Amino acid sequence: SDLVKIRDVSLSTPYVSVIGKITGIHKKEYESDGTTKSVYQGYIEDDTARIRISSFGKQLQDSDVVRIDNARVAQFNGYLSLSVGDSSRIESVNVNIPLEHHHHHH
């Protein structure tokens, strides 16, 4: 459940923590144990690349910067994505943290 980059997401790390902004919120429903449950899907990006995400029960906000802890990696439609269950934790980032000179990538 350590902090890793989106491009570093793989099955080798079932539990991982990521931070970025979620965009394009999509709503979908599926049958869970015979009970219909709502799940939100969207895309998240950071300083590296972007990946698909899926949240069960918890809602997501467009272009909202949040941090996901204990995320579960899974393959959907042959595509890797992070699944946020009720056991995972989501923390919003309302405090700025620039530091250092972002003018040069070096």
Rounded Cα distance, 59 and 79, in Å: 22
Q: Which domain holds residue 22?
A: 1-103
Rounded Cα distance, 61 and 34, in Å: 28
Residue 96: CATH number of its domain: 2.40.50.140
Rounded Cα distance, 41 and 103, in Å: 34
Specify the number of domains making up the chain.
1
> What's the token pair of residue 96?
């700025």
φ/ψ bin of 13: left (φ > 0), alpha (ψ from -120 to 50), beta (otherwise): beta
> What's the token pair of residue 39?
């799940």
Coil, helix or strand at residue 7: helix
Coil, helix or strand at residue 63: coil
Q: Which amino acid is present at 78? A: G
Query: Strand 50-56 vs strand 64-76: parallel, antiparallel, or unpaired?
Result: unpaired
Residue 90 backbone phi and psi in degrees, to 5 = -120, 130
Name residue, tokens 């996901």. Answer: 68
Coil, helix or strand at residue 77: coil
> What's the token pair of residue 33?
């144990």
